[model samples]
Target: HMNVGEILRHYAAGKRNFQHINLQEIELTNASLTGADLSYANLHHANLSRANLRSADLRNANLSHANLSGANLEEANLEAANLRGADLHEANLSGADLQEANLTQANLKDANLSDANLEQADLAGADLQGAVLDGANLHGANLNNANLSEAMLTRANLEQADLSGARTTGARLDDASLHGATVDPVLWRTASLVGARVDVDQAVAFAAAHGLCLA
Candidate 1:
């Protein structure tokens, strides 16, 4: 484990060179590092708790199992990053680009992920309690065993996304896309079906409204 706090201090003060540096398992809690370039870096299992990563470019970075609890990553570019089992509770990732990222079992409690681009990302068993995901693109993403309790997800696109066996209590799905999305019978019982398309046996009103036309 490298000196994550020391290195972040240098990078946060009008300087940066985090590319290709290994800082696995380093503790860097609550570091204000906005607009930094962590492109192609290795930060696996590092503690980035409450760090500000706003608008940072983390393209092709390896951050698997890192701790990012309460970090602010608004509009950050995380294309093709590895984030499996990372703790991201209360992180803000609005408008971030996460195309083809791996986030299996990642904890995202209370995270604000509005307008985030999550094309083809894997999120199996991820905990997302109280998260905001309005206008987020979840094309082909997996959400099995993921918790989406109390999430505000208006206008979020879930085209071709898999949500089998996911929990959704008190979640708002206003204007959200469910084209080819799979949900359990219990989830639809209490969850909002406004503007969402689901496939089910018999005449489903939600599917009919969205023009899914599934009989």
Candidate 2:
């Protein structure tokens, strides 16, 4: 039952463990929350811009509609957390664990998710422009309607991912796994997909097996 100003001051003074605290809609910009544990907390619409959340534990927390632009989430555990409609522009999420987390409608432009684990996460309608996802694990993740323009997903695992209607223009997935992935067919310079990972050989075989073809 600590005061919100005291909590904000403590957070700014580099304390990260705030379990079960209700910080919903609190304007906590530029906080220093390194290694803090805010598990199962309610942080909906909290203004956490430029906050330092390195190695923080936000498991099962609610961050829906929060403005987390330029926040650092390195090595954080956000399993089953709700991040729907959050603004994460230029956020750093390297080596983070987001298993079963919901990031639907999040703005992740220029975010760094390198080596992150997102297994079974829901990322529908997320904007991931210029994001780095190298060596990331995305198994069983739902990325329907997500925008991955200029995203680098080299050596990432996308097995069993549902990417229906995802727009990945200029996205690099070199050596990335696409086993059981949902991708659309059709090649065009504008609003289309064509790359070294995809080709006519696989297209024809995929078409014959699935009874679908590109125009």
Candidate 3:
């Protein structure tokens, strides 16, 4: 239940640990809070647009419905965080740890998630249009019905991931692993699969049924 003014004052006084703090329904646009420790905090519906959170620890934080569009969260630790329905459009999450995090229905359009750890994460129905997931770990993750149009997923680990009904129009899958992944009804045509691992016969069959080409 603390205001951002009070939080800024405390931060200016060298208090970096803001764990479990309540910062719901507020706007902190463009604030620079590098290396801030906000682990397990409740920031639901808060607006952190374009804020600098580089190297910050946000593990287990509840950020559902928060607006973090265009934020700089590079190298941030957001493991197991709740980000359902959050707006992370164009955010920089390169090298961030988002393992087991909940991103269901989250808007991640054009976000940079290269080298990020998203293993076992829930990304069901999330908007990942034009997002960069290069070299990211998505092992056993839930990506059902996610929008992946024009997204870059090169070399990403997607073993056992659920991609049912997901759209991948013009997305890259070069060197990406789809071993044992569920892609029932997924849009595979128009996606690049050069050197990508998958059931070739099944994929071709699916593409043929959809009146498209996957070769």
Candidate 4:
């Protein structure tokens, strides 16, 4: 396995195609890798904290257990990437394409995912506290048991998404689409839905369970 330094040096020397490179357990914190093509790379358990990866092509990359806290991934192409157990706290992923990605158990607290494409992505058990997902596409995504407290999901799509057992306390669902989405009754009560198309019966039932009268 080549070292991250050598790989980065090669990239800086006009080498963009570093597909399938092994970067497991490597430390590349605060690195500037803008527009680098690391498609299909194996970056499992790598430490890329606060790295600048803006517009980078990371399609189908394996980034499981990677630490990318505060990283800049704006407009990056991470479609189908494996991000299971990755730490992306406070990362900027606005306009990134994460379609069908595997983000199971990932830490995305306070991450900026506005206008990102996360359609069909697996976010089960992920921590999304205060994350910005406004206008993001989460259609058919798996968000079971995920934490979405204080998250911004305005105008986001959740059609047919599995949100069972998820926590959404203080979450903003304004104008968000929930058509065919599966949300547990307890979690549904905690969320604030304004202009959202949610199951009315569920809300009423939840209110009755809490001894609150619904108008």
Candidate 5:
């Protein structure tokens, strides 16, 4: 159990390792904690809005419902972290590692996730409106009922991902890989898939959705 002052004081004194600490509900808005090691820490509902968390180690950390709006988490290690319902609006997560992370119902509107690794992450019901996911790896990710309206997913890898009931209205998927992905037929008419790679079955489904029945 660490207080906000002690953590900030230690961070100012060049101490970066704060793994396994209990920081639930602590207010650390706009704090600069770059390259800090907070792996497996308990930060549930913490106020980290606009904080500088670039390249920080937060693997398996409990950050559910944390306020991380506009935080810079670029290149941070957040693999398997619990970020359910976390507010990440406009957060910079470019190149972050979020493999298998639990981000269900999280608010990631307009977040920058370009080149981030979110393979197999659970993002069910997440609000990703206008989010930038260019070249991100989402292979086998669970995106059921996720709202990806107007999101930029160009060149992203969505192989074998579950997109059932997911909303991709006006989303850009140019050059994206959707082979073996479980996408609803309705998404074919809503999202842009210029030059995207899809399986033959998926292509047939798309065509069927467009009232074309090829023999």
Candidate 6:
């Protein structure tokens, strides 16, 4: 039940472990909290724009509707975090762990997520326009209806991921694996698939969908 000022004071005093703290709806813009442990914290609707949260432990934190635009969350542990409707535009989530996290309707425009682990994450209706997901692991992730337009997904793993109804216009899928992914064949028309790996049946379907006239 600590207030924003108290948290800031404690953070300034080098207190990194703030696990399970309740700071809901607090205005903490541009706070420098690198390597802070905010795991299981109740940060619902908190405004943390441009905050430096590099290597922070945020596992299971409730960040629903929070404004985290331009925050630096590189290598942060956000496993199973509730980030629904959160604004993470231009956020740096590179090498972060978001396994099983709830990112429904979250705005991740132009975010850098290279080498992040997002296995089993729920990203339904998330806006990922111009995001960089190079080498990210998205196995079993649910990306239904998500906007991935112009996203960089080179060398990413999408095995068993559900991409039905997802937008892939101008997306780069080069060298990415789509094995067992549930994607619409029409997405192949707009997305770049050079050196991309896919299941044989799905590839045939994609060819047929694009009028390849396979015998």
Tens digits of lDDT, candidate 2, 88-180: 999999999999999999998999999999999999999988888888999999989899888887888887787778877888777777666
Question: What digit string (tens of lDDT, one per residue) describes model 5 on residues 1-215?
Answer: 89988999999999999999999999999999999999999999999999999999999999999999999999999999999999999999999999999999999999999999999999999999999999999999999999999999999999989999999899999999999999998899998999999888998899999999877
| TM-score for each of the candidates | 0.86, 0.85, 0.91, 0.92, 0.98, 0.97
lDDT at position 107, candidate 6: 98
The sequence of per-residue lDDT tens digits that candidate 4 reaches over residues 85-156 is: 999999999999999999999999999999999999999999999999999999999999999999999999
The pairs that clash in candidate 2 are 16-36, 16-37, 17-36, 17-37
Number of the candidate with higher TM-score, 2 or 3:
3
Report lDDT (Cα) of residue 58, candidate 2: 96
User: In model 6, where do residues sit more than 4 Å from their true spots?
Assistant: 213-215
Which pairs clash (backbone N, Cα, C closer than 3 Å) in model 1? none
Per-residue lDDT over 25-119 for candidate 1, one digit per residue giving the tens place of the 0 to 100 score: 77778877677777888888888888888988888888899999888889998999999999888888999998888888888888888999998
Candidate 5 similarity to native, TM-score: 0.98
- Show model 3 residue runs off by greater than 4 Å: 185-188, 199-215
> Best-fitting candidate, measured by TM-score?
5
Residue 185 Cα positional deviation in candidate 6, in Å, after optimal superposition: 1.4
Worst 10 residues of 2 by lDDT: 186-195
Model 2, position 77, has a per-residue lDDT of 92
RMSD of each: 3.7, 3.9, 3.0, 2.5, 0.8, 1.0
Q: Kindly provide the TM-score of model 4 when superposed on the true structure, using C-alpha atoms.
A: 0.92
Instruction: Candidate 3: count the clashes.
Output: 0
| Candidate 6 local lDDT, 10-45, one digit each (tens) | 998999999999999888898889999999999999
lDDT (C-alpha) at residue 170 in model 3: 84
Evaluate model 6: give its lDDT.
0.95
Count the clashes in each prediction. 0, 4, 0, 0, 0, 0
